[PDB]
Amino acid sequence: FHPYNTLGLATQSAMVGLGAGVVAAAARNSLATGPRNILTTFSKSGGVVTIFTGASIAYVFTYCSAANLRERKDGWNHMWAGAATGAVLGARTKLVPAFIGWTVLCGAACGLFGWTGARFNADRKASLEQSPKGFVQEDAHQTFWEVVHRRPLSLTVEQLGEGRGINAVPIATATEAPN
Amino acid sequence: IAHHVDKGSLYRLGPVGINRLLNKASYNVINLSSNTRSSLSMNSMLILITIVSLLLLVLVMNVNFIIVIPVLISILYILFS
Amino acid sequence: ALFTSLVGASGLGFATKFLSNKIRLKPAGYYPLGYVFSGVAWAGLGLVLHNVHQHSLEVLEKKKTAL
Amino acid sequence: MLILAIISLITFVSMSKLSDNRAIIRLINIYLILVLVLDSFLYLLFLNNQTYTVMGELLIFNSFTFYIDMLIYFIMIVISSLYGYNLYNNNLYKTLFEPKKELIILFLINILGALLIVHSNDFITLFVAIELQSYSIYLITAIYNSSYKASKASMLYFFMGGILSILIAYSINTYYSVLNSYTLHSLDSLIINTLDLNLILIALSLGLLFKIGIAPLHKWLISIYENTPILITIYISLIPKISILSYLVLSNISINSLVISILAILTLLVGSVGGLLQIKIKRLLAFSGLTNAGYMMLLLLLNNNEFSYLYYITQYSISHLAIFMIIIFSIYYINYINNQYNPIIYVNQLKGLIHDNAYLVLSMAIVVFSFIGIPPLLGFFGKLNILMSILNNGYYFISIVLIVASLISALYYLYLLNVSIQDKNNILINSNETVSSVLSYILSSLIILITFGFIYNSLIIDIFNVYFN
Amino acid sequence: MFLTSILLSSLYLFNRILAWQGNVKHFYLFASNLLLLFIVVLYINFNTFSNSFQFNFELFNSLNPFGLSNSDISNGLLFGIDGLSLTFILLTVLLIPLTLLGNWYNINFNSNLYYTLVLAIGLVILLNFWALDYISFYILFEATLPLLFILIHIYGSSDSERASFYVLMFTLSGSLFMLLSIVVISIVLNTTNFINHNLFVLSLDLQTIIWLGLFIAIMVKTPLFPIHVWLPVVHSESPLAGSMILAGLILKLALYAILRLLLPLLCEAQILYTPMIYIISLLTIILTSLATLRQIDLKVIIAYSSISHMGIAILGVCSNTSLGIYGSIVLGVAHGFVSPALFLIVGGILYDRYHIRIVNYYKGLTTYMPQLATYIIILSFANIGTPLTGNFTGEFLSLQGGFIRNPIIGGISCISVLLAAIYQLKLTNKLTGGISSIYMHRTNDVTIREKFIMNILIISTLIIGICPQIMYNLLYWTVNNYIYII
Amino acid sequence: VELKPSSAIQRGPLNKGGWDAPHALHNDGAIDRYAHWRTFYQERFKYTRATGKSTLIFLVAFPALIGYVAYQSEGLFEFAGKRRGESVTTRG
Amino acid sequence: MFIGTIILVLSFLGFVFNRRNIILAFICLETMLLGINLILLRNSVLFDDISGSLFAIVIIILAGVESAIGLSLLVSYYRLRGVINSYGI
């Protein structure tokens, strides 16, 4: 893998969240009911700026940190980032069990989002349609979407491990009397 | 067990918590177009906000993806909390 | 088979007539000629589908023959 | 046949009284039936997916569009039957459901715009047809001018559709500014990967999609569907959706868009959650249509989506017509007429329908469990084919969102059934008035299709494999 | 002759019977016993020396949608029975008439709808055991939820609305993940059939994903901890026929689903995942039993009791041992006999006399209701796994297999033998013991009908406990078809 | 026209037609209230220092213990017919 | 390109942020169509192309019909209400 620059990405994160919070505050000011002016965009906004900035900083910082600590790029980093973002969103409600639930559940949700590829889109060169499918032809290495009538036994033993029934030689041939 | 796990947390991660979650989310979804005084200006503002927000989000994702994720999480929070 | 398809489509037609009579809060034998009319109508639809399907298979077989 | 019908009905309605409009609707309903019977052999033109360009290169004719046109004729037949045949021959039902003089003409012109949208190959035809649809459907929302709610909805719908049409025109003229063309046939592999063109194309897609309620622009159309008459809602909630989504499916415009994915997820979540606290029937059904529009948005990201879209749109049309017809039939047993225009508004007015009409509740149950996607019904096979396509094309998070939305929507679908199978005091014991024969048969036929159409899935696939592949 | 002539004869006879006597229960019971006899004839004509599928038939084919297919291109739904299918089919046809007769005299409003829904659920379950592809299996696995919703909502107890919504929503939640699994299978292999699906070896990283969905479904349907909370409510607040059908057959559909959908396919994912199955099963056993020890509703206690025995069955079926598979199947059958008898006692005998299920009201039934006390003691000691009942045989062999696979987990799971006794006998001792309750007046003892049902269900379990081997002629292939050992 | 339902609709009461049997149970009220409480406990449950203890025990710690044991004891033991001196373990 | 984008954007903002009139909404729609037509015709001149001018004259016709229909709908609203107020469409 290639390391992430935490502080730079998180500074970009904070500026983006700040701009988004300003836009949401302006939208709230214009959509609202009561008497309002150019003063109220930050007085009467329900912590929108702090929501956006905190979520952005927390998510990007935690993601890049976990990617640099774990030394990997996978969906567990999105699980941690969701845990942190949920902790921020749940510290607003000044209650412990709601904070814990927010953390755990948005961690699980963003971790699912990362497990599935960290994308609302598709890869479109890893999809089943664009990838080699069906039965594999002549002793070739079975790819992900390919099908096989009969698999290699060394592969089974490595993927699964010896023990609990699964052995490098069948039992009957391995116990056959040398006659 | 019977009261704190089987009739507690496993109903919270279950029929009770989902019910409360969806009550709050539904109420926030329908109390969004707040003012029935004028239906036209409000939805017009919604067109404007949608177009602006989409343009800035597409800018942000072209810059880098992972930065748009918490923005969308916060948008869902604003819409559904 | 054709006869099976026509019988089944006529059964669907009888079901429509029955459910109509019941939605109307009438007895199920209110006007028994409607069963005959529904039968022949739905059987005509089934015959049409049968012929379309048969022509489709004939096309995909003519392709093999010409291949 | 539609233009012949329009030019005939304009004269025949001008030279006729208001006592004759129901019979006029009956006549043109039989006309559409005869057309769909005698002229439907034209499917043989599209054998092996032969495609034709007509009126220069302004229209396109293939199996997809022929099917959508047959479907729109079937829908117009049902909607005209609801106006041409009295449910009950009482003074109440001659006060609630009366056709206005120009309504049938506007329906046929809107159908014309619908079909010229799906058959469009050049953006000038698309724009002319979009406007011919939208002007006519403004006037359809407004024809019941003795309703405050309907006039209000007319004007909101005018302005919002106008703005979204401005967006469509900006998209079209920007496409022309870039490529000097109004035709999407002008695009290929090379032009897509050589020019960055996604802003224009997604602007077009969203200008078309927000005209059918795609979030976050759903509240206005849901208010319009609530505030309009029931027999107008049944039309204006279905036919524009079919037209525009069919155009956007035939035109492969958003094959792997991130924005359309995001907005489709948002449509699913909103259409599932927002319908949970709705106490009114038409808003509930509007949010149902919203989430189904989301399911159909998902297959704008596929590039091989004909079977799934056609199955789902056919089954959704049948279910939509059936549920609105059941709500129309339930007015005889509700204990409180709310308006001259929306005689039934709230779901709890359906309380105890099983004790007055049990088989109407059987129909409701069938339709509700098709909406939920319960096998062996038709919505299950719809959802199955959609899932097949989106998982074959690599949308794995959207699939889980789809399951969660399917589950959350079941609650407000089951609200209706639950209150319908509840007990009620003051049940019905006798009634000498009987509901119509024709409308009863139409509803029963739709229910039987929902229930027993899975028998023919093999045959439908075998026909598709010859006419669409 | 004609097919249509014969079924039109049956249809006309049904219509005239309904016209003259305004009830359907006699005709449905006649059809019940007729179907049982036909299935016994099929067992007479069943070859035990072939592992193949027999009595095959295909429906909804392109060439004959309203008939059976003889085609060289097969695009419809496949059906056919193996010995495993036939075992549960025998159980189903044995139980259906008893579920109809258990509610013979206690349904006095819209009776015909009740009996239609009961027979329909039973026939859907039968056809589900007859299925031979993922899609027919699915459409018969999910088609019971509408019927169960309606039945429980209209004909259920106080809290019937909640139970109706639960039995639909929980099961739909699990079954939609099953649907994602099946969709992946169909798009990857382009075939869905239970005949040659062990010939298609998928990659491990995809097996491990398909297995997750199938196992989430199996977890919600079995049930297994932590998704077991719907079962007390549903089995409690349903009509008696619903509870009997559910506990006897719908819970066993999950066991059959493991053996038919998840082991033959997905062998390597299963052999990698089964320690997680053992975690979940041991939790499901011990915590559900202890939770039973603090319940105040009788039918709820029996409902919780089903879960622990299904967890033991899961230990057995996920053991990769022939004895474990046979034990799980015998557990399914014997529980399908015994648990509906307990449900009859607590939902059709006592509930029909007193219309209450709180334990605090019940005490000293032995004085005025002695036959019922004898039945309670017999069925309790059968449910907890006393020898010479099939419950013990199944428990013994399932725990044998679990010990062979994981000695530590399989050995710790043998406290089932104790906890079963605790939560069953703490109830039996109070019901049968003491002075008769001051909150209850005297009522009749068990009738000839109730006794008939309980005696059938006791004779069956005693037969299969005294000689379990009589079930081997339909299972000596199945006990080796789903074992992955090199 | 005053929009009212149809006068043709004759309505009567819902009569389920059961034979009202005598009172076989004398309900207590205290027991019924105890039963309602113990059946609908789920709607009143709250997360406290006592309940969270049982949650984080039975849903986090005990499964983790069982899982560690199960994944360490996966293919360790094979003692069919094993004899004196022969190791019953496959690994160390 | 510039005049049209400017007219379009300012008309859209004067439509969205109108807390005054309904006539301003009508005016902003018409000016939006005007702006689109001007961009369209400038591109028509630069490319030396007729499709742009054809689309423009079609927009003229369609906008006329739009105005007619919109001001019939307003007249129905006024038939029932008698006053078209600052708010409420």
Ligand SMILES: CCCCCCCCCCCCCCCCCC(=O)OC[C@H](COP(=O)(O)OCCN)OC(=O)CCCCCCCCCCCCCCCCC
């Ligand atoms: C200024 C400097 C700029 C610097 C450059 C970088 C800036 C980045 C800017 C990013 C865009 C920020 C836009 C913020 C959202 C718009 C503001 C808003 O409030 O939206 C909601 C809006 C009004 O809501 P409100 O009136 O406040 O009342 C709420 C009560 N429920 O009402 C609305 O309906 C409008 C909705 C607009 C939504 C746009 C589409 C969002 C897509 C949702 C993503 C969902 C995907 C997640 C899927 C997960 C599935 C579980």
Ligand SMILES: CCCCCCCCCCCCCCCCCC(=O)OC[C@H](COP(=O)(O)OCCN)OC(=O)CCCCCCCCCCCCCCCCC
């Ligand atoms: C790119 C990454 C994207 C991945 C997705 C990330 C997810 C981001 C989610 C954030 C969006 C905002 C949604 C937050 C939920 C809305 C309601 C809420 O604020 O939660 C609180 C609610 C409170 O219940 P209560 O405490 O009793 O009431 C007082 C509350 N002031 O809470 C409760 O009712 C109790 C909750 C108990 C826990 C229930 C857990 C159920 C889990 C299954 C969820 C399925 C339903 C999903 C609904 C979707 C809603 C958007």
Ligand SMILES: CCCCCCCCCCCCCCCCCC(=O)OC[C@H](COP(=O)(O)OCCN)OC(=O)CCCCCCCCCCCCCCCCC
């Ligand atoms: C109709 C009413 C009349 C008023 C009309 C107003 C004028 C119309 C403006 C344009 C048309 C509206 C478009 C609607 C928004 C949605 C656009 C869209 O979704 O297209 C995005 C598309 C990429 O998305 P996609 O193809 O789905 O994903 C694959 C990515 N390779 O394509 C792209 O990649 C977009 C390219 C990114 C650049 C976006 C430009 C934004 C720049 C703003 C910077 C402002 C400066 C900083 C902040 C200032 C605030 C103080």
Ligand SMILES: CCCCCCCCCCCC(=O)OC[C@H](COP(=O)(O)OCC[N+](C)(C)C)OC(=O)CCCCCCCCCCC
């Ligand atoms: C067509 C009127 C639609 C109105 C709604 C009624 C549904 C009619 C379905 C016939 C479709 C067909 O047979 O065709 C199959 C089409 C393409 O074939 P085609 O080019 O259109 O030729 C048809 C030539 N006809 C017009 C002479 C027949 O494939 C599809 O994806 C159809 C998907 C629809 C699935 C819904 C099934 C409903 C159950 C049908 C029980 C009889």
Ligand SMILES: CCCCCCCCCCCCO[C@H]1O[C@H](CO)[C@@H](O[C@H]2O[C@@H](CO)[C@H](O)[C@H](O)[C@@H]2O)[C@H](O)[C@H]1O
């Ligand atoms: C609400 C209940 C939720 C529980 C249900 C959980 C099911 C979620 C689906 C889990 C399976 C997703 O499958 C996952 O597998 C492979 C690894 O095997 C991931 O691995 C792939 O990730 C993507 C993202 O970098 C790239 O293509 C990468 O090269 C790799 O090939 C995929 O990103 C994802 O598709």
Ligand SMILES: CCCCCCCCCCCCO[C@H]1O[C@H](CO)[C@@H](O[C@H]2O[C@@H](CO)[C@H](O)[C@H](O)[C@@H]2O)[C@H](O)[C@H]1O
């Ligand atoms: C709840 C169950 C249903 C969940 C819904 C989703 C089901 C589908 C599962 C997601 C499939 C993910 O599959 C995706 O990742 C695998 C890796 O694991 C990749 O497979 C590829 O991995 C690469 C390594 O990166 C290797 O070269 C390998 O030989 C293969 O080519 C593919 O890019 C794609 O097939």
Ligand SMILES: CCCCCCCCCCCCO[C@H]1O[C@H](CO)[C@@H](O[C@H]2O[C@@H](CO)[C@H](O)[C@H](O)[C@@H]2O)[C@H](O)[C@H]1O
């Ligand atoms: C809904 C109620 C639930 C009912 C569930 C019970 C269904 C029981 C059906 C079992 C009977 C199946 O028995 C099945 O035998 C053979 C398979 O070799 C089928 O196939 C037979 O077709 C005929 C064709 O003329 C010939 O004999 C052919 O050689 C073949 O033997 C039969 O068409 C079918 O009858």
Ligand SMILES: CCCCCCCCCCCCO[C@H]1O[C@H](CO)[C@@H](O[C@H]2O[C@@H](CO)[C@H](O)[C@H](O)[C@@H]2O)[C@H](O)[C@H]1O
């Ligand atoms: C009381 C309620 C709160 C308690 C709820 C407890 C739920 C459990 C949440 C803890 C999640 C931590 O889970 C942790 O597991 C994975 C592996 O399992 C770790 O990540 C590890 O994964 C493995 C794969 O298994 C990688 O290849 C790599 O070795 C890495 O070190 C992550 O650092 C972390 O995600």
